[PDB]
């Protein structure tokens, strides 16, 4: 078949690029950068170097706090045996504070760990924010992943801080485990009657179905008109080439109407974001403002109703 | 009316099926032989669900609310057979409309590609979309043996089919595929976030400076994680992510009651009675 | 084209038939042990 | 003179989707028997059911 | 406060509603965005008006945003007002909506999948201002590396299969290292033509580049460059889509329709 | 990974996906191991009774000789076919109560009656059988103890879930929902049943710990959520199926075992039937399901035995 | 060994310190964590002094 | 054997002591993890000295 451009089918090696220059005063980059050819298949074959400055460092240290906080508590749950540590892994994590303890600090193994370790992870994340903005800033650009991983952290906050404390309750929050915090998922969504019906649960998925729907479109656009460089998009912005241009007239036909190469972009930009400001809204809205979702649905109309074919007596009613 | 730099594009030839018949467009659309045949299967679809919505599940329910609204798939005992119209049967119709739109508008794309001279990764991508809705309706139902275990056509009835199959496993987040999937579509919407900020703050920059180039991009994602995979490579990838998420969702939903009856956490005991521990 | 002539053909399948059906000797017994140990039709 | 096909078809990606078409829909023919009871030999030759009895059901009360 | 507003009105149904009065605002600012390109329309609706009735659709067109280039490139406004260009075709058929069949030999038309716009006569620029797009033997410090085969030497065949050339050299982009051109000696004349790589497909066994958008004897016509060791951004395009027109003018067959 | 198609037993409405599947080689399995034992042929009509003859019989009193002695031959068959009379007998004396196990069944005998008699909201005409239980072994193969987790340090709290356990079917929420559900009578509701705040404080994790014994609930009866659910709306009734019902009063007639029958006879029992919290071998469900939506899948034995009703 | 002195012509001394300094501050948070987790050598819960 | 030391001329001698410093410190952790996971060898759950 014709060159897919898939995989990169000859490389080309050229000494390692060092970074365009930082401002005077910024710390150097880290790291001599090696090739790897099989990364150069797929995409770049440099890996490296790296920014480690103050901000990064201590987020890799209040990071590595929570980590080793939660992985130490996982191998206490096992009672320290190592090979139970792996049989289980999946299955291990660090459980949030009892019911009984409110937003009180409670001991280590009853909930205590979680809060340092959920304190030491937000550190971090914050703190990697700030690198994440540092970077930018230094390099001249908009702050436009800073904002992206504001909108992602503000979901995560959602999750294990501010919503457990509108609750009052830090047994509200998230296990720090692989299959505890899916089995957190699922109790939420039965807890607060079936979280399909939350509306912004509803358009995080739409968001989240758009991302996928959007990547794939602009992914597979941008390859199919890479035989025109379309792949340097910078070019086809300030300079619309013949790439651009096919790219737009091929969504035009399809479905009669068409973004240009930077507003993909900006298509691109808001699905994502979107997916994790409404995830983050309907997360604070159940339970504060709504008990039962599929209830909340009755009332206003949303819920569809089926013909009784199969009912229950209810034991209560008697 | 076209794009003030498309008239120069639009070529006769370039179909599939037609030639000259229907080569040509209406206002924006291509139509071609699957514009043709897309719409009126679009059409037709469209109308017999909401000729569904007018009769209802019976005449006490019925509801034209857009919520509510829901052409149900038949009975289980219907096997792999035909339903009456009301019973199932409407459902069996407008599955077969909403295909033959959905191929029809892959190959109408096929056939626009060819006008363009392009690639056909969008095509090639939409397929998988249209084979995870296959798998769903079709492929899962029959190795099934009934029609009626595909999801209802309803915005919220076919959630409800969605958590009711769920809950036919008892913890449908333990199944593998479907772990594999979401994360897929977690890392895509990450990727596209990352794509998207990066291409708009280069080209948006601070003010008073002037764009930036792709020295800038490789830069910055090497200055935050320590690798760039390229302006090219980020398309791949993103195309890859999701891709592979709606490949192992189709996967995940395909061997959930076809290839796996017990609950998926249950699965994992390959694992949990590995000799090793 | 495959970068070989037609005489290394005649040998390569030559032997290939050899080895093909001694192999398929080995299932026929095989199966004929296992149908004569618990038929399976 | 049926080698017509050999100028119109290349011998290799026939004989590749020949092979291909083959060995699904021997594939498929054989799941298909396995999926009818009646032919399901891995059940075995001396394949009986359970017996049910006292008002046994295999399966529970459906719609 | 409370959770309910009204008897039936409560904080999320006010939240979701809030969501679609941004929601709506902010499809009608990508709208908006989306339109900084190729707009207004060239409709038959301006024609009839005699350019009194300008096709912009809703959302209007945003105020024009400044792109400054890097290097003095100059400053580009994404809304620009753009020059009608002419077509090399004529409509097939009088009624709206028909497509336009190409004037002349179509590989050579500049029409459908052979057009292109006329992009700035300058070269891509590095960050460092040396020209991004150049040939081996100019970016000496490049190097194919050592596990992929060497393009050059490499024989160059079209779409049916006989030879049009040899690779004589590779064109890499200098800021994000990759082969994006192989230049050809041509069989025929022996001018050098660029090739693009996506219209390029390895054989790494037979050391074959087979192009299948264009024969051997549409070599020939391939869009030279001014400068030998260069390429301006408008004779990339050039070059790019004079492949592209094979994909669908080349051969006789690839007009279609298959049945 | 299993062979399609598998057996499907709708239960709800067409496209709301209220389904049992079944695989037919798993199932068949299953049936195999699950069998019912035939009953004896009835006994001879008329005879001494029971109460001229016997001594120290103070449960099947109302019985005929003959059909006490039908009784104690199926019980043998039902609880100890590999040790005989002697399993609950002193050899030589039938009368004397001088061996645990005799205490222990002649409460059983009453667990068995009035299970028949007055729990027919679950067992509905089907009825008991010490065999719906014991299959033949003198301990019950699905029994159930408070489960204190894995071993913790010793300065470690236990969470009681995070680990994988079939009690819950290889997830990781709480692993010992037996305790608190079937043995105690802790709310097993937690979800609110108004749309907006009502005053439910019930917490996330209670959720885990009703999750878990629903996990177990359902592996028990072989089945999935929606053979008692319609999973958009758990809490409904309504769009809940007759089995739910069922079940409802099953974990009553559990607790109701375990507490007025299993429990009392703790000092009788010896340390073997012990957990390590020392509590009792308790009757959960999985006790007489084993994995079956009915017991033994509906066999009808108790109507057999006149002396497993309550006179 | 009185040569033990040349390892470091092999191992790079900035490394080897920022990776034992890092592996031994690990050590000793796992170790006294393993004593709180324990309940004989809590020495924050024991109760002594009373 | 007299010519044990010719292992180094292949293997480098950097890699494999960062190798083995690392194996046996896992080695020792998991080891000793194992041994307190046991309530015969936790001598710091089983009492001795009371
Ligand atoms: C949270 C997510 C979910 C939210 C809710 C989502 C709900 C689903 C959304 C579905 C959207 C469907 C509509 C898509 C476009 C329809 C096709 C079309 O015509 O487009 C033209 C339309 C306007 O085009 P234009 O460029 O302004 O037109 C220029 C002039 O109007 C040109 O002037 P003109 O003279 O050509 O004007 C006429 C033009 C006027 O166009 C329209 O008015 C159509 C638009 C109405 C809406 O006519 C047409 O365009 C159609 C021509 C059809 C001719 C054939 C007629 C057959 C009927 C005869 C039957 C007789 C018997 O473009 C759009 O409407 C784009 C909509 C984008 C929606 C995206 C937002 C939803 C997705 C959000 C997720 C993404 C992430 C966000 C972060
Ligand atoms: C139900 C009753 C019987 C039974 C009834 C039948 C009947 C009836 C038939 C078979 C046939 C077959 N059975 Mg049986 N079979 C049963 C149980 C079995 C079991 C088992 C362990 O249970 C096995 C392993 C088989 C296996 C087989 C095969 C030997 C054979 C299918 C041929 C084939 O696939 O060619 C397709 C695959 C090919 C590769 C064909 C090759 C030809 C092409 C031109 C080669 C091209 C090569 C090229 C490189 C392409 C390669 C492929 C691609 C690269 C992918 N049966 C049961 C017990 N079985 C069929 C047969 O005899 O065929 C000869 C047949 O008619
Ligand atoms: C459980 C019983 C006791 C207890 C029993 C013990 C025992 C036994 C030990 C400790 C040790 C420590 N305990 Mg204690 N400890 C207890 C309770 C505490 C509490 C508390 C809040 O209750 C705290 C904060 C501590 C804290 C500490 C640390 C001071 C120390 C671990 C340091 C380390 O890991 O370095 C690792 C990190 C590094 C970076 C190592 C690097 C080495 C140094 C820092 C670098 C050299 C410095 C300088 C250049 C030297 C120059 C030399 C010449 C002058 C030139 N313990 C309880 C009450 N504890 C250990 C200790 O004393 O070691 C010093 C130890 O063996
Ligand atoms: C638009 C919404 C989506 C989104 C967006 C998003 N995420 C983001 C961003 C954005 C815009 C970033 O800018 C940021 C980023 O950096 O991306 C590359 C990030 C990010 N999203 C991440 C993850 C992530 N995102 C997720 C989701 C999503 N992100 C949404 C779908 C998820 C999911 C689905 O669960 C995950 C898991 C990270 C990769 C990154 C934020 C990284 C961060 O905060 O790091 C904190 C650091 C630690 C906790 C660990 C530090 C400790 C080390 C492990 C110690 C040991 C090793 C050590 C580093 C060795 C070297 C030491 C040196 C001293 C030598
Ligand atoms: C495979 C990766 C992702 C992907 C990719 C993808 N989708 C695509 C494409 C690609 C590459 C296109 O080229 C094509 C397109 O042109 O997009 C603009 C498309 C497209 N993906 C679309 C939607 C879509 N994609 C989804 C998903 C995904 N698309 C994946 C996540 C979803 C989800 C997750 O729900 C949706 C809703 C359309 C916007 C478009 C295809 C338009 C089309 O086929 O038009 C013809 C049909 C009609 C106009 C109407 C047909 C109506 C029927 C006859 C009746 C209704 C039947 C239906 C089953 C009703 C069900 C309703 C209930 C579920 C509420
Ligand atoms: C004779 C006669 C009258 C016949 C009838 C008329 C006929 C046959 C018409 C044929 C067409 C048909 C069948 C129409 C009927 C069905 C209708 C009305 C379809 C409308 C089209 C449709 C399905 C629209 C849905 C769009 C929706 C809701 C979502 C799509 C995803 C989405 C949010 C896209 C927005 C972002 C965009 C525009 C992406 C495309 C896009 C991408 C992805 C780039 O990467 C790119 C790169 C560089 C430049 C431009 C682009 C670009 O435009
Ligand atoms: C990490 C492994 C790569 C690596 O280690 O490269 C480092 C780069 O810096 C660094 O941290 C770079 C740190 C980030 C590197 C890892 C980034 C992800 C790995 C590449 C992923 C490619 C595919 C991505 C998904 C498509 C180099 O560091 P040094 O030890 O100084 O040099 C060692 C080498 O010269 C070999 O002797
Ligand atoms: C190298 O590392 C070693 C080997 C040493 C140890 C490694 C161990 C390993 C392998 C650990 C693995 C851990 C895993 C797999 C963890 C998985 C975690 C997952 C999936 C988590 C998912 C979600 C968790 C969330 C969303 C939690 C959010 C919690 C928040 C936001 C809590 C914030 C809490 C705060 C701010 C506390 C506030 C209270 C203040 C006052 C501090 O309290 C006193
Ligand atoms: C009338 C019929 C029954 C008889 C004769 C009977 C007899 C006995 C005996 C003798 C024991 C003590 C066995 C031992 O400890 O070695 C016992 C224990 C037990 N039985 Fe039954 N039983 C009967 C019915 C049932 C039923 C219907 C259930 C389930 C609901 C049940 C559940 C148990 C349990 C859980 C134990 C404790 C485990 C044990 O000690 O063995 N039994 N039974
Ligand atoms: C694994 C699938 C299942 C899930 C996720 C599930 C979930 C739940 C939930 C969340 C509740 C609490 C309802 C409320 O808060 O009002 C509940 C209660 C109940 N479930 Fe289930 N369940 C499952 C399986 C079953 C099955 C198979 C049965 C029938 C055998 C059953 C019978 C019941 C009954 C009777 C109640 C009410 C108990 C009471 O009020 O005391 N469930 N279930
Ligand atoms: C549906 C999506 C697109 C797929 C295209 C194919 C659709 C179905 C193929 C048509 C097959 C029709 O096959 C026909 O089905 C009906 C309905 O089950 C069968 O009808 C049979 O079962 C039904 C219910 O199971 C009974 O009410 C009826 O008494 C019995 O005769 C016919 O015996 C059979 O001849
Ligand atoms: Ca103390
Ligand atoms: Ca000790
Ligand atoms: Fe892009
Ligand atoms: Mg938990």
């Given at each position: ?318 | ?277 | ?41 | ?53 006292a ?9 | ?259 | ?33 699950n069998l019912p034992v035939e009953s004896l042929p009835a006994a001879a009509p008329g005879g001494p009774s029971v109460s001229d003859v016997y001594e120290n019989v103070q449960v099947l009193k109302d019985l005929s000789v003959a059909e006490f002695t039908r009784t104690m031959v199926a019980v043998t068959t039902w609880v100890a076919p590999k040790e005989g009379c002697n399993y609950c007998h002193v050899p030589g004396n039938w009368a004397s109560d001088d061996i645990y196990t005799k205490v222990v069944s002649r409460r059983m005998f009453e667990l068995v009656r009035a299970t028949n008699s007055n729990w027919k909201?679950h067992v509905?005409?089907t009825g008991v059988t010490c065999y719906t239980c014991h299959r033949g072994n003198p301990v019950p193969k699905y029994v159930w103890v408070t ?31 037996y305790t608190?559900?079937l043995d ?69 007639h559990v607790r109701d075992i375990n507490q007025n029958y299993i429990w009392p006879l703790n000092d009788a029992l010896p340390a073997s039937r012990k957990g390590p919290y020392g509590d009792p071998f308790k009757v959960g469900c999985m006790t007489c399901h084993q994995?079956?939506?009915?017991p033994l899948?509906?066999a009808q034995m108790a109507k057999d035995y006149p002396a497993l009703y309550e006179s | ?50």
């Amino acid at each position: 078949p014709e060159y897919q451009n898939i995989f990169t089918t000859v490389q080309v090696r050229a000494p390692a690029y060092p970074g365009v220059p930082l401002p005077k005063g910024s710390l150097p980059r880290i790291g001599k950068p090696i090739f790897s050819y099989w990364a150069g298949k797929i995409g770049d074959a440099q890996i490296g170097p790296i920014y480690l400055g103050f901000t990064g460092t201590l987020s890799i240290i209040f990071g590595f706090m929570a980590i080793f906080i939660i992985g130490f508590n996982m191998l206490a749950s096992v009672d320290w045996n190592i090979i139970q540590f792996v049989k289980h892994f999946f299955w291990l994590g660090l459980e949030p504070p009892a019911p009984q303890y409110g937003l009180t600090i409670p001991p280590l193994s009853e909930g205590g760990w979680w809060l340092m370790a959920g304190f030491f992870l937000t550190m971090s994340i914050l703190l990697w924010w700030v690198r994440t903005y540092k970077r930018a800033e230094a390099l001249g650009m908009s702050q436009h992943l800073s904002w992206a991983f504001a909108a992602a952290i503000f979901f995560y906050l959602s999750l294990g801080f501010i919503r457990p404390v509108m609750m009052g309750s830090w047994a509200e929050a998230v296990p720090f485990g692989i299959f505890p915090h899916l089995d957190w998922t699922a109790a939420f969504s039965i807890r607060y009657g079936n979280l399909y019906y939350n509306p912004f649960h509803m358009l995080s998925i739409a968001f989240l179905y758009g991302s996928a729907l959007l990547f794939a479109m602009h992914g597979a656009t941008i390859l199919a008109v890479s035989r025109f460089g379309g792949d340097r998009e910078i070019d086809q912005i300030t300079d619309r080439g013949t790439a651009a241009e096919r790219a737009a007239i091929f969504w035009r036909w399809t479905m009669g109407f068409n973004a240009s190469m930077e507003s993909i972009h900006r298509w691109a930009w808001w699905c994502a974001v979107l997916t994790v400001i409404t995830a983050g809204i309907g997360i604070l809205l159940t339970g504060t403002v709504v008990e039962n979702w599929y209830l909340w649905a009755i009332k206003h109309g949303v819920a569809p109703a089926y013909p009784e074919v199969v009912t229950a007596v209810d034991p209560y009613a008697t | 009316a076209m794009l003030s730099f498309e008239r120069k594009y639009r070529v006769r030839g370039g179909t599939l099926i037609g030639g000259d018949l229907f080569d040509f467009w209406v206002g924006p659309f291509y139509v071609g032989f699957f514009g043709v045949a897309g719409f009126f299967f679009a059409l037709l679809g469209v109308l017999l669900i909401v000729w569904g919505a007018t009769i209802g599940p019976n005449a006490e329910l019925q509801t034209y609310n857009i919520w509510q609204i829901s052409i149900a798939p038949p009975d289980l005992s219907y096997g792999l057979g035909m339903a009456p119209m009301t019973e199932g049967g409407l459902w069996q119709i407008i599955t077969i409309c909403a295909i033959g739109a959905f191929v029809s508008w892959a190959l109408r794309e096929v056939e626009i590609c060819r006008k363009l001279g392009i690639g056909f990764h969008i095509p090639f991508a939409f397929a998988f979309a249209i084979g995870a809705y296959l798998v769903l309706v079709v492929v899962r139902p029959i190795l099934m043996g009934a029609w009626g275990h595909g999801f209802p056509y309803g915005i919220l009835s076919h959630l409800d089919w969605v958590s009711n199959v769920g809950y036919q496993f008892l913890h449908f987040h333990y199944n593998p595929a479907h772990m594999l999937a979401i994360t897929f579509f977690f890392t895509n919407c990450l990727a596209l976030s990352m794509h998207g900020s990066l291409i708009l703050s280069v080209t948006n920059p601070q003010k008073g400076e002037e764009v930036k180039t792709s020295e800038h991009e490789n830069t910055f994602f090497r200055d935050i994680v320590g690798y760039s995979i390229g302006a090219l490579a980020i398309h791949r990838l993103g195309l890859f992510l999701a891709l592979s998420a709606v490949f192992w969702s189709a996967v995940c939903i395909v061997i959930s009651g076809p290839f796996w009856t017990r609950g998926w956490p249950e699965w994992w005991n390959w694992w949990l009675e590995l000799p090793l521990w | 084209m495959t970068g070989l002539t037609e005489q290394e053909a005649q040998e390569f399948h030559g032997i290939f038939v050899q080895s093909m059906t001694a192999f398929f000797g080995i299932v026929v017994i095989a199966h004929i042990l296992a149908w004569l140990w618990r038929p399976w039709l | 003179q049926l080698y017509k096909i050999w100028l119109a078809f290349d011998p290799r990606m026939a004989l590749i989707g020949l092979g291909a078409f083959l060995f699904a829909l021997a594939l498929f023919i054989h799941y298909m028997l396995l999926r009818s009871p009646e032919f399901d030999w891995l059940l075995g030759p001396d394949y009986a059911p359970v017996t049910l009895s006292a008002g046994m059901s295999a399966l529970p009360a459906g719609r | 406060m409370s959770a309910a507003i009204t008897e039936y009105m409560d904080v999320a149904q006010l939240t979701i509603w809030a969501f679609w009065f941004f929601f709506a605002g902010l499809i009608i600012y990508l709208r908006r965005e989306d339109k900084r390109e190729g707009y207004p329309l060239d409709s038959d609706r301006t024609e009839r008006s005699g350019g009194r009735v300008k096709v912009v659709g809703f959302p209007d067109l945003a105020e024009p945003k400044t792109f400054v280039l890097p290097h003095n490139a100059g400053t580009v406004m994404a809304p620009r007002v753009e020059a009608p260009t002419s077509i090399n075709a004529t409509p097939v058929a009088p009624f709206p909506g028909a497509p336009f069949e190409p004037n002349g030999d179509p590989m050579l038309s500049g029409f459908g999948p052979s057009a292109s716009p006329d992009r700035a006569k300058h070269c891509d620029l590095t960050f460092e201002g040396l020209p991004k797009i150049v040939p081996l033997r100019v970016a000496t410090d490049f190097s194919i590396a050592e596990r992929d085969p060497d393009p050059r030497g490499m024989t160059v065949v079209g779409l049916d299969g006989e030879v049009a050339g040899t690779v004589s050299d590779v064109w890499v982009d200098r800021s994000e290292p990759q082969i994006r051109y192989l230049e050809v000696k041509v069989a025929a004349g022996g001018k050098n033509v660029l090739l693009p790589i996506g219209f390029s497909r390895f054989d790494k066994k037979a050391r074959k580049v087979k192009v299948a958008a264009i024969k051997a004897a549409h070599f020939a016509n391939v869009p030279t460059l001014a400068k030998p060791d260069q390429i301006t951004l408008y004779e990339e395009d050039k070059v790019c889509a004079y492949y592209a027109g094979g994909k669908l003018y080349a051969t006789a067959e690839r007009a279609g329709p298959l049945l | 990974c299993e062979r399609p198609p598998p057996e499907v037993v709708q239960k709800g409405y067409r496209g709301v996906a209220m389904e049992q599947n079944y695989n037919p080689r798993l199932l068949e399995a299953s049936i195999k191991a699950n069998l019912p034992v035939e009953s004896l042929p009835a006994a001879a009509p008329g005879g001494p009774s029971v109460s001229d003859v016997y001594e120290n019989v103070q449960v099947l009193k109302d019985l005929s000789v003959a059909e006490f002695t039908r009784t104690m031959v199926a019980v043998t068959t039902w609880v100890a076919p590999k040790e005989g009379c002697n399993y609950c007998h002193v050899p030589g004396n039938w009368a004397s109560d001088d061996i645990y196990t005799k205490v222990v069944s002649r409460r059983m005998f009453e667990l068995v009656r009035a299970t028949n008699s007055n729990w027919k909201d679950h067992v509905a005409e089907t009825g008991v059988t010490c065999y719906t239980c014991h299959r033949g072994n003198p301990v019950p193969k699905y029994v159930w103890v408070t489960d204190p987790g894995p071993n913790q340090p010793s300065g470690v709290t236990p969470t009681g879930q995070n680990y994988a356990s079939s009690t819950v079917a290889y997830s990781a929420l709480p692993l010992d929902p037996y305790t608190p559900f079937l043995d105690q009578s802790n709310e097993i509701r937690v979800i609110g049943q108004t749309a907006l705040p009502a005053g439910n404080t019930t917490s996330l994790k209670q959720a885990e710990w009703t999750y878990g014994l629903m996990m177990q609930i359902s592996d028990s009866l072989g089945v999935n959520c929606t053979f008692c659910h319609n999973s958009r709306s758990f809490y409904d009734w309504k769009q809940s199926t007759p089995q739910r019902t069922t079940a409802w009063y099953a974990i009553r007639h559990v607790r109701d075992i375990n507490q007025n029958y299993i429990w009392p006879l703790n000092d009788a029992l010896p340390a073997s039937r012990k957990g390590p919290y020392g509590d009792p071998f308790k009757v959960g469900c999985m006790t007489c399901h084993q994995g079956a939506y009915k017991p033994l899948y509906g066999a009808q034995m108790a109507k057999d035995y006149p002396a497993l009703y309550e006179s | 060994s009185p040569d033990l002195w040349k390892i470091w012509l092999l191992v790079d001394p900035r490394r080897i310190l920022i990776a034992v300094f890092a592996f031994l501050t690990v050590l000793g948070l796992a170790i006294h964590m393993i004593l709180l987790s324990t309940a004989e050598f809590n020495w924050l819960e024991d109760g002594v002094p009373a």
